[PDB]
PDB file of C-alpha atoms and ligand atoms in Angstrom:
ATOM      1  CA  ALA V   1       0.068  -0.042   0.021  1.00 53.25           C
ATOM      2  CA  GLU V   2       3.067   2.269  -0.604  1.00 58.15           C
ATOM      3  CA  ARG V   3       1.138   4.800  -2.607  1.00 56.03           C
ATOM      4  CA  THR V   4       3.277   7.663  -1.556  1.00 56.48           C
ATOM      5  CA  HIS V   5       6.153   5.825  -3.084  1.00 58.52           C
ATOM      6  CA  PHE V   6       4.455   5.069  -6.272  1.00 60.79           C
ATOM      7  CA  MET V   7       3.422   8.748  -6.653  1.00 63.66           C
ATOM      8  CA  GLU V   8       6.899   9.766  -5.771  1.00 63.41           C
ATOM      9  CA  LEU V   9       8.407   7.705  -8.512  1.00 61.88           C
ATOM     10  CA  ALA V  10       5.808   9.143 -10.983  1.00 64.72           C
ATOM     11  CA  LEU V  11       6.803  12.697  -9.894  1.00 66.56           C
ATOM     12  CA  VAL V  12      10.484  11.676 -10.593  1.00 63.94           C
ATOM     13  CA  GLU V  13       9.483  10.664 -14.042  1.00 59.88           C
ATOM     14  CA  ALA V  14       7.572  14.009 -14.502  1.00 58.90           C
ATOM     15  CA  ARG V  15      10.490  16.055 -13.493  1.00 57.48           C
ATOM     16  CA  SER V  16      12.740  14.101 -15.639  1.00 58.55           C
ATOM     17  CA  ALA V  17      10.442  14.446 -18.679  1.00 58.75           C
ATOM     18  CA  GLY V  18      10.156  18.209 -18.173  1.00 60.65           C
ATOM     19  CA  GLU V  19      14.076  18.479 -18.295  1.00 61.92           C
ATOM     20  CA  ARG V  20      14.317  16.595 -21.622  1.00 62.47           C
ATOM     21  CA  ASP V  21      11.781  19.253 -22.913  1.00 64.26           C
ATOM     22  CA  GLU V  22       8.675  16.789 -22.800  1.00 63.15           C
ATOM     23  CA  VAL V  23       5.422  17.421 -21.033  1.00 58.83           C
ATOM     24  CA  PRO V  24       6.249  17.048 -17.348  1.00 58.26           C
ATOM     25  CA  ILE V  25       3.886  14.043 -16.604  1.00 61.05           C
ATOM     26  CA  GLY V  26       5.138  10.740 -15.081  1.00 62.80           C
ATOM     27  CA  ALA V  27       3.379   7.399 -14.483  1.00 63.13           C
ATOM     28  CA  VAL V  28       4.014   3.974 -12.930  1.00 63.89           C
ATOM     29  CA  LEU V  29       2.504   0.743 -13.486  1.00 60.81           C
ATOM     30  CA  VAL V  30       1.987  -1.280 -10.361  1.00 58.96           C
ATOM     31  CA  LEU V  31       1.211  -5.002 -10.123  1.00 60.39           C
ATOM     32  CA  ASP V  32       0.832  -6.798  -6.891  1.00 55.37           C
ATOM     33  CA  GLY V  33       2.265  -4.036  -4.838  1.00 55.94           C
ATOM     34  CA  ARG V  34       5.241  -3.727  -6.973  1.00 56.99           C
ATOM     35  CA  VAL V  35       6.438  -1.126  -9.666  1.00 59.53           C
ATOM     36  CA  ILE V  36       6.867  -3.073 -12.976  1.00 61.06           C
ATOM     37  CA  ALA V  37       7.157  -0.016 -15.215  1.00 62.19           C
ATOM     38  CA  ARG V  38       7.925   3.789 -14.984  1.00 63.38           C
ATOM     39  CA  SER V  39       8.028   6.421 -17.499  1.00 62.04           C
ATOM     40  CA  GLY V  40       7.346  10.176 -18.448  1.00 64.98           C
ATOM     41  CA  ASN V  41       6.030  11.617 -21.707  1.00 63.44           C
ATOM     42  CA  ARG V  42       8.297  10.677 -24.629  1.00 65.99           C
ATOM     43  CA  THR V  43       6.338  12.046 -27.709  1.00 64.85           C
ATOM     44  CA  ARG V  44       9.211  14.322 -28.778  1.00 65.56           C
ATOM     45  CA  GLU V  45      12.014  11.749 -28.494  1.00 69.53           C
ATOM     46  CA  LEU V  46      10.025   9.130 -30.150  1.00 68.06           C
ATOM     47  CA  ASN V  47       8.155  11.254 -32.827  1.00 69.27           C
ATOM     48  CA  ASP V  48       5.143   9.591 -31.478  1.00 67.52           C
ATOM     49  CA  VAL V  49       2.083  11.472 -30.183  1.00 68.39           C
ATOM     50  CA  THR V  50       0.855   8.396 -28.452  1.00 70.64           C
ATOM     51  CA  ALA V  51       3.827   8.270 -26.313  1.00 73.49           C
ATOM     52  CA  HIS V  52       2.177   9.761 -23.208  1.00 71.34           C
ATOM     53  CA  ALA V  53       3.513   8.444 -19.731  1.00 73.29           C
ATOM     54  CA  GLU V  54       0.397   6.301 -19.340  1.00 74.95           C
ATOM     55  CA  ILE V  55       0.629   4.614 -22.519  1.00 79.48           C
ATOM     56  CA  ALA V  56       4.424   4.311 -22.316  1.00 76.95           C
ATOM     57  CA  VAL V  57       4.155   2.312 -18.991  1.00 76.51           C
ATOM     58  CA  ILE V  58       1.354   0.227 -20.350  1.00 76.89           C
ATOM     59  CA  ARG V  59       3.520  -0.853 -23.352  1.00 78.87           C
ATOM     60  CA  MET V  60       6.561  -1.298 -21.114  1.00 74.83           C
ATOM     61  CA  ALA V  61       4.631  -3.574 -18.573  1.00 73.13           C
ATOM     62  CA  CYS V  62       2.866  -5.616 -21.278  1.00 68.88           C
ATOM     63  CA  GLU V  63       6.397  -6.173 -22.824  1.00 67.04           C
ATOM     64  CA  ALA V  64       7.785  -7.294 -19.477  1.00 66.73           C
ATOM     65  CA  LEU V  65       4.777  -9.613 -18.739  1.00 66.54           C
ATOM     66  CA  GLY V  66       4.472 -10.762 -22.436  1.00 67.55           C
ATOM     67  CA  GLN V  67       0.636 -10.116 -22.266  1.00 65.16           C
ATOM     68  CA  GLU V  68      -1.731  -7.949 -24.350  1.00 66.74           C
ATOM     69  CA  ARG V  69      -3.634  -6.598 -21.241  1.00 65.31           C
ATOM     70  CA  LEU V  70      -2.996  -5.668 -17.731  1.00 61.65           C
ATOM     71  CA  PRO V  71      -6.019  -6.995 -15.717  1.00 61.97           C
ATOM     72  CA  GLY V  72      -5.311  -6.465 -11.876  1.00 60.82           C
ATOM     73  CA  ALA V  73      -2.775  -3.639 -12.360  1.00 60.01           C
ATOM     74  CA  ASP V  74      -2.854  -0.149 -11.031  1.00 60.59           C
ATOM     75  CA  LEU V  75      -1.745   2.881 -12.716  1.00 61.61           C
ATOM     76  CA  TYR V  76      -0.473   6.115 -10.831  1.00 63.53           C
ATOM     77  CA  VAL V  77      -0.201   9.234 -13.081  1.00 62.20           C
ATOM     78  CA  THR V  78       0.847  12.693 -11.827  1.00 63.36           C
ATOM     79  CA  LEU V  79      -1.940  14.301 -13.852  1.00 62.66           C
ATOM     80  CA  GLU V  80      -5.566  13.309 -14.892  1.00 64.86           C
ATOM     81  CA  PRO V  81      -5.248  11.088 -18.047  1.00 64.31           C
ATOM     82  CA  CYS V  82      -6.362  12.598 -21.465  1.00 62.57           C
ATOM     83  CA  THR V  83      -8.870  11.155 -23.911  1.00 62.96           C
ATOM     84  CA  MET V  84      -6.371   8.925 -25.707  1.00 61.64           C
ATOM     85  CA  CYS V  85      -4.875   7.493 -22.422  1.00 61.00           C
ATOM     86  CA  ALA V  86      -8.326   7.055 -20.704  1.00 61.32           C
ATOM     87  CA  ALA V  87      -9.266   4.816 -23.700  1.00 59.49           C
ATOM     88  CA  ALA V  88      -6.132   3.009 -23.680  1.00 58.87           C
ATOM     89  CA  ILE V  89      -6.530   2.334 -19.931  1.00 56.77           C
ATOM     90  CA  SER V  90      -9.876   0.800 -20.586  1.00 55.89           C
ATOM     91  CA  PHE V  91      -8.575  -1.324 -23.233  1.00 52.28           C
ATOM     92  CA  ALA V  92      -5.710  -2.614 -20.963  1.00 52.15           C
ATOM     93  CA  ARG V  93      -8.260  -3.493 -18.327  1.00 53.44           C
ATOM     94  CA  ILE V  94      -6.298  -1.606 -15.527  1.00 56.94           C
ATOM     95  CA  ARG V  95      -7.985  -2.285 -12.207  1.00 58.02           C
ATOM     96  CA  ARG V  96      -7.257   1.000 -10.470  1.00 64.68           C
ATOM     97  CA  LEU V  97      -6.198   4.395 -11.789  1.00 67.75           C
ATOM     98  CA  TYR V  98      -4.677   6.973  -9.212  1.00 65.95           C
ATOM     99  CA  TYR V  99      -3.851  10.470 -10.317  1.00 65.76           C
ATOM    100  CA  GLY V 100      -2.961  13.787  -8.922  1.00 67.90           C
ATOM    101  CA  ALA V 101      -4.523  17.069 -10.217  1.00 66.72           C
ATOM    102  CA  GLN V 102      -7.419  17.321 -12.540  1.00 69.05           C
ATOM    103  CA  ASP V 103      -6.840  18.554 -16.117  1.00 74.11           C
ATOM    104  CA  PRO V 104      -9.821  20.532 -17.344  1.00 73.07           C
ATOM    105  CA  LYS V 105      -8.218  21.414 -20.686  1.00 74.92           C
ATOM    106  CA  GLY V 106      -7.743  17.957 -21.913  1.00 77.54           C
ATOM    107  CA  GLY V 107      -8.496  15.334 -19.167  1.00 77.72           C
ATOM    108  CA  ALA V 108     -11.020  12.591 -19.817  1.00 77.77           C
ATOM    109  CA  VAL V 109     -11.662  10.918 -16.517  1.00 80.97           C
ATOM    110  CA  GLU V 110     -13.431  13.389 -14.300  1.00 83.06           C
ATOM    111  CA  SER V 111     -12.980  16.241 -16.701  1.00 86.41           C
ATOM    112  CA  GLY V 112     -13.799  16.415 -20.645  1.00 87.33           C
ATOM    113  CA  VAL V 113     -15.542  13.540 -22.115  1.00 89.54           C
ATOM    114  CA  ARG V 114     -15.518  11.653 -18.920  1.00 90.44           C
ATOM    115  CA  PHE V 115     -14.901   8.456 -20.878  1.00 88.02           C
ATOM    116  CA  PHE V 116     -15.436   5.861 -18.193  1.00 88.85           C
ATOM    117  CA  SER V 117     -19.025   7.071 -17.857  1.00 87.06           C
ATOM    118  CA  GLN V 118     -19.919   6.790 -21.389  1.00 85.91           C
ATOM    119  CA  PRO V 119     -21.922   4.112 -23.141  1.00 86.81           C
ATOM    120  CA  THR V 120     -19.197   3.371 -25.575  1.00 83.82           C
ATOM    121  CA  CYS V 121     -16.676   2.557 -22.940  1.00 85.62           C
ATOM    122  CA  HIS V 122     -16.913  -1.079 -22.057  1.00 82.06           C
ATOM    123  CA  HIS V 123     -14.387  -1.309 -19.201  1.00 82.55           C
ATOM    124  CA  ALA V 124     -13.672   1.104 -16.325  1.00 83.02           C
ATOM    125  CA  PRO V 125     -11.051   1.058 -13.552  1.00 81.75           C
ATOM    126  CA  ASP V 126     -11.494   2.323  -9.883  1.00 82.58           C
ATOM    127  CA  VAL V 127     -10.653   5.913 -10.123  1.00 82.70           C
ATOM    128  CA  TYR V 128      -8.918   7.939  -7.210  1.00 81.86           C
ATOM    129  CA  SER V 129      -7.884  11.519  -7.756  1.00 81.32           C
ATOM    130  CA  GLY V 130      -6.085  14.135  -5.993  1.00 82.63           C
TER     131      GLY V 130
ATOM    132  CA  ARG T   1      -9.722   7.674 -52.754  1.00 85.12           C
ATOM    133  CA  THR T   2     -10.491   4.435 -54.338  1.00 88.69           C
ATOM    134  CA  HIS T   3      -6.780   3.244 -54.183  1.00 91.56           C
ATOM    135  CA  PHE T   4      -6.499   4.363 -50.669  1.00 92.40           C
ATOM    136  CA  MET T   5      -9.496   2.559 -49.539  1.00 91.30           C
ATOM    137  CA  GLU T   6      -8.381  -0.512 -51.679  1.00 89.54           C
ATOM    138  CA  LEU T   7      -5.129  -0.751 -49.892  1.00 87.17           C
ATOM    139  CA  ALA T   8      -6.864  -0.121 -46.393  1.00 85.75           C
ATOM    140  CA  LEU T   9      -9.248  -3.015 -47.309  1.00 82.82           C
ATOM    141  CA  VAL T  10      -6.106  -5.084 -48.070  1.00 82.38           C
ATOM    142  CA  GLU T  11      -4.696  -4.423 -44.656  1.00 82.10           C
ATOM    143  CA  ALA T  12      -8.036  -5.132 -42.989  1.00 81.28           C
ATOM    144  CA  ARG T  13      -8.352  -8.489 -44.529  1.00 79.99           C
ATOM    145  CA  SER T  14      -4.835  -9.561 -43.628  1.00 80.21           C
ATOM    146  CA  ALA T  15      -5.246  -8.403 -40.145  1.00 79.15           C
ATOM    147  CA  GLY T  16      -8.262 -10.747 -39.897  1.00 76.45           C
ATOM    148  CA  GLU T  17      -6.207 -13.575 -41.083  1.00 73.26           C
ATOM    149  CA  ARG T  18      -3.683 -12.837 -38.315  1.00 75.33           C
ATOM    150  CA  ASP T  19      -6.547 -13.184 -35.722  1.00 77.77           C
ATOM    151  CA  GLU T  20      -6.574  -9.602 -35.225  1.00 78.28           C
ATOM    152  CA  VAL T  21      -9.509  -7.351 -35.475  1.00 79.45           C
ATOM    153  CA  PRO T  22     -10.041  -6.891 -39.281  1.00 79.31           C
ATOM    154  CA  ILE T  23      -9.392  -3.244 -39.673  1.00 81.43           C
ATOM    155  CA  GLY T  24      -6.983  -1.533 -42.029  1.00 83.37           C
ATOM    156  CA  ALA T  25      -5.610   1.884 -42.748  1.00 81.41           C
ATOM    157  CA  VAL T  26      -3.344   4.114 -44.883  1.00 81.22           C
ATOM    158  CA  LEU T  27      -1.771   7.386 -44.201  1.00 81.96           C
ATOM    159  CA  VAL T  28      -1.606   9.766 -47.212  1.00 82.27           C
ATOM    160  CA  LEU T  29       0.542  12.748 -47.914  1.00 78.31           C
ATOM    161  CA  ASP T  30       0.658  14.797 -51.061  1.00 79.65           C
ATOM    162  CA  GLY T  31      -1.489  12.383 -52.774  1.00 88.23           C
ATOM    163  CA  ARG T  32       0.668   9.442 -52.068  1.00 84.62           C
ATOM    164  CA  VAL T  33       0.423   6.450 -49.449  1.00 83.67           C
ATOM    165  CA  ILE T  34       3.298   6.833 -47.012  1.00 84.96           C
ATOM    166  CA  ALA T  35       2.244   4.185 -44.439  1.00 86.38           C
ATOM    167  CA  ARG T  36      -0.147   1.253 -44.435  1.00 88.51           C
ATOM    168  CA  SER T  37      -1.208  -1.291 -41.603  1.00 88.86           C
ATOM    169  CA  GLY T  38      -3.819  -3.278 -40.078  1.00 85.65           C
ATOM    170  CA  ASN T  39      -4.457  -3.891 -36.199  1.00 87.68           C
ATOM    171  CA  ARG T  40      -1.487  -5.366 -34.567  1.00 90.54           C
ATOM    172  CA  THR T  41      -2.547  -5.228 -30.829  1.00 92.00           C
ATOM    173  CA  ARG T  42      -2.199  -9.031 -30.312  1.00 94.20           C
ATOM    174  CA  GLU T  43       1.081  -9.364 -32.168  1.00 95.88           C
ATOM    175  CA  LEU T  44       2.644  -6.512 -30.261  1.00 98.45           C
ATOM    176  CA  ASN T  45       1.098  -6.909 -26.913  1.00102.65           C
ATOM    177  CA  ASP T  46       0.005  -3.307 -27.291  1.00103.63           C
ATOM    178  CA  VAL T  47      -3.603  -2.293 -26.893  1.00 99.47           C
ATOM    179  CA  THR T  48      -2.693   0.862 -28.782  1.00 98.32           C
ATOM    180  CA  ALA T  49      -1.606  -0.865 -31.832  1.00 95.70           C
ATOM    181  CA  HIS T  50      -4.771   0.012 -33.765  1.00 95.16           C
ATOM    182  CA  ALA T  51      -4.408   0.339 -37.516  1.00 96.38           C
ATOM    183  CA  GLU T  52      -4.769   4.170 -37.173  1.00 95.25           C
ATOM    184  CA  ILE T  53      -2.118   4.646 -34.517  1.00 95.62           C
ATOM    185  CA  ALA T  54       0.134   2.106 -36.368  1.00 95.12           C
ATOM    186  CA  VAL T  55       0.067   4.095 -39.562  1.00 94.91           C
ATOM    187  CA  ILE T  56       0.479   7.412 -37.567  1.00 93.37           C
ATOM    188  CA  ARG T  57       3.826   5.884 -35.874  1.00 94.34           C
ATOM    189  CA  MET T  58       4.963   4.706 -39.125  1.00 95.84           C
ATOM    190  CA  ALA T  59       4.361   7.760 -41.116  1.00 98.70           C
ATOM    191  CA  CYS T  60       5.992   9.802 -38.414  1.00101.24           C
ATOM    192  CA  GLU T  61       9.071   7.660 -38.315  1.00 98.75           C
ATOM    193  CA  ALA T  62       9.276   7.901 -42.140  1.00 96.78           C
ATOM    194  CA  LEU T  63       9.165  11.758 -42.116  1.00 97.94           C
ATOM    195  CA  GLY T  64      11.014  12.125 -38.774  1.00 98.46           C
ATOM    196  CA  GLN T  65       8.374  14.452 -37.286  1.00 98.54           C
ATOM    197  CA  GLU T  66       6.095  14.364 -34.305  1.00 98.78           C
ATOM    198  CA  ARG T  67       3.030  15.593 -36.191  1.00100.11           C
ATOM    199  CA  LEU T  68       1.486  14.958 -39.446  1.00 97.84           C
ATOM    200  CA  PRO T  69       0.067  18.276 -40.743  1.00100.86           C
ATOM    201  CA  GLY T  70      -1.701  18.007 -44.078  1.00101.66           C
ATOM    202  CA  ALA T  71      -1.819  14.283 -43.985  1.00101.48           C
ATOM    203  CA  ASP T  72      -5.042  12.405 -44.557  1.00103.03           C
ATOM    204  CA  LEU T  73      -6.040   9.028 -42.960  1.00100.32           C
ATOM    205  CA  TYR T  74      -8.033   6.316 -44.409  1.00100.57           C
ATOM    206  CA  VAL T  75      -9.519   3.547 -42.199  1.00106.01           C
ATOM    207  CA  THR T  76     -12.088   0.818 -42.770  1.00106.73           C
ATOM    208  CA  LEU T  77     -13.905   1.334 -39.574  1.00109.55           C
ATOM    209  CA  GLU T  78     -14.830   4.506 -37.770  1.00112.39           C
ATOM    210  CA  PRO T  79     -11.916   5.295 -35.294  1.00111.12           C
ATOM    211  CA  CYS T  80     -12.393   4.624 -31.590  1.00108.27           C
ATOM    212  CA  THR T  81     -11.957   6.931 -28.763  1.00108.26           C
ATOM    213  CA  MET T  82      -8.220   6.322 -28.442  1.00109.29           C
ATOM    214  CA  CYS T  83      -7.491   6.888 -32.109  1.00110.79           C
ATOM    215  CA  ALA T  84      -9.862   9.859 -32.488  1.00111.13           C
ATOM    216  CA  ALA T  85      -7.629  11.374 -29.855  1.00112.00           C
ATOM    217  CA  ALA T  86      -4.451  10.426 -31.562  1.00111.87           C
ATOM    218  CA  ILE T  87      -5.737  11.654 -34.892  1.00112.87           C
ATOM    219  CA  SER T  88      -6.234  15.024 -33.218  1.00113.69           C
ATOM    220  CA  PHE T  89      -2.702  14.995 -31.720  1.00115.46           C
ATOM    221  CA  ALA T  90      -1.200  14.241 -35.056  1.00114.69           C
ATOM    222  CA  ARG T  91      -2.986  17.115 -36.654  1.00114.72           C
ATOM    223  CA  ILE T  92      -4.351  14.886 -39.436  1.00114.26           C
ATOM    224  CA  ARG T  93      -5.972  17.055 -42.135  1.00116.36           C
ATOM    225  CA  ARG T  94      -8.749  14.702 -43.417  1.00116.29           C
ATOM    226  CA  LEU T  95     -10.183  11.494 -42.008  1.00114.46           C
ATOM    227  CA  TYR T  96     -11.977   9.130 -44.306  1.00116.59           C
ATOM    228  CA  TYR T  97     -13.501   5.982 -43.033  1.00112.13           C
ATOM    229  CA  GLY T  98     -16.043   3.226 -44.089  1.00113.24           C
ATOM    230  CA  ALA T  99     -18.519   1.748 -41.771  1.00115.44           C
ATOM    231  CA  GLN T 100     -19.721   3.333 -38.513  1.00114.05           C
ATOM    232  CA  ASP T 101     -19.021   1.859 -35.098  1.00116.33           C
ATOM    233  CA  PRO T 102     -21.902   2.934 -32.845  1.00116.64           C
ATOM    234  CA  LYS T 103     -20.520   0.395 -30.210  1.00115.32           C
ATOM    235  CA  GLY T 104     -17.021   1.821 -29.727  1.00118.40           C
ATOM    236  CA  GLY T 105     -16.699   4.719 -32.265  1.00117.99           C
ATOM    237  CA  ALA T 106     -15.838   8.256 -31.287  1.00116.56           C
ATOM    238  CA  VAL T 107     -16.387  10.367 -34.368  1.00117.28           C
ATOM    239  CA  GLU T 108     -19.912  10.285 -35.445  1.00121.07           C
ATOM    240  CA  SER T 109     -20.635   7.791 -32.673  1.00119.80           C
ATOM    241  CA  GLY T 110     -20.119   7.964 -28.832  1.00118.65           C
ATOM    242  CA  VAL T 111     -18.172  10.878 -27.423  1.00119.81           C
ATOM    243  CA  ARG T 112     -18.007  12.591 -30.810  1.00117.63           C
ATOM    244  CA  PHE T 113     -14.688  13.764 -29.915  1.00117.19           C
ATOM    245  CA  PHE T 114     -13.973  16.420 -32.660  1.00116.83           C
ATOM    246  CA  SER T 115     -16.972  18.415 -31.415  1.00116.97           C
ATOM    247  CA  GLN T 116     -15.664  18.532 -27.824  1.00114.61           C
ATOM    248  CA  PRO T 117     -13.870  21.430 -25.983  1.00112.28           C
ATOM    249  CA  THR T 118     -11.169  18.983 -24.833  1.00112.60           C
ATOM    250  CA  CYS T 119     -10.268  18.368 -28.547  1.00112.90           C
ATOM    251  CA  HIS T 120      -7.946  21.089 -29.749  1.00112.53           C
ATOM    252  CA  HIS T 121      -7.742  20.001 -33.324  1.00112.63           C
ATOM    253  CA  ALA T 122     -10.137  18.406 -35.664  1.00111.32           C
ATOM    254  CA  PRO T 123      -9.812  16.859 -39.190  1.00109.73           C
ATOM    255  CA  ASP T 124     -12.416  17.306 -41.808  1.00109.47           C
ATOM    256  CA  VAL T 125     -14.467  13.925 -41.807  1.00110.04           C
ATOM    257  CA  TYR T 126     -15.780  11.935 -44.522  1.00109.40           C
ATOM    258  CA  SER T 127     -17.619   8.577 -43.943  1.00104.18           C
ATOM    259  CA  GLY T 128     -19.220   5.859 -45.983  1.00102.18           C
ATOM    260  CA  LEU T 129     -16.232   4.950 -48.218  1.00103.56           C
ATOM    261  CA  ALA T 130     -16.341   1.411 -49.280  1.00100.73           C
ATOM    262  CA  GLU T 131     -18.787   0.853 -46.305  1.00100.47           C
ATOM    263  CA  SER T 132     -20.178  -2.427 -47.656  1.00102.90           C
ATOM    264  CA  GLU T 133     -16.870  -4.210 -48.031  1.00103.90           C
ATOM    265  CA  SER T 134     -15.380  -2.652 -44.639  1.00103.19           C
ATOM    266  CA  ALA T 135     -18.599  -3.915 -42.826  1.00100.63           C
ATOM    267  CA  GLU T 136     -18.636  -7.110 -44.558  1.00 98.54           C
ATOM    268  CA  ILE T 137     -15.129  -8.031 -43.236  1.00 98.60           C
ATOM    269  CA  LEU T 138     -16.233  -6.929 -39.649  1.00101.46           C
TER     270      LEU T 138
HETATM  271 ZN1   ZN K   1      -2.537  10.972 -22.720  1.00100.57          ZN
HETATM  272 ZN1   ZN K   2      -8.813   2.856 -32.186  1.00101.74          ZN
END
């Protein structure tokens, strides 16, 4: 239940991302109480608009585990996920989503399209913000 | 457009044969196809590997740029919520797609992303291209 530690790692990733001129957002993917993936935004570095921290750790964890989805895993992010990441989180079958502040300009969990509450969303995680 | 959809359909049928969701897409720039792909989520253990994102990633690698301004994307099925957002981020100029997806779509269906305040860039949308074939192959 080391949530403070999980968020700290995400904050570290966020700071590092900012230093390399990326959007300062970080995330960690946890499975069975252990961090199995960590990352900040890498869209500039990879010339990939989908390389947001959330998707980066989802791809990394899936590669480490050799599975197409992450049922039972928890995702910690420094900022409310956007529309693209919210949908990816749903597709990955993430169990719990923990994030810091809301992002009114582009969020999609409690802000914006509130994807997890829409009829076109077929899977939603637990959501703990702030 | 006929050639672009022809190729997208080729990718869609191939994806189905690979036990992937039978969806295909092509990325066009200056009237030429610069990327083509079907779904690869199962092959790559990557739920983001939808045809749309695959071609955006490939085209960006081929051009060495983060965004694809002026590019058009053709896909056999209406983009989902994740892809609609990626399409926005990539600054795609025009989006052409075949069949509608009322179950998981996000363009004309569902959240109708391009009409939302949290979307900061919308492509011009054209639907119904080769709808029968696209829908026929799921
Ligand atoms: Zn995102
Ligand atoms: Zn999609």
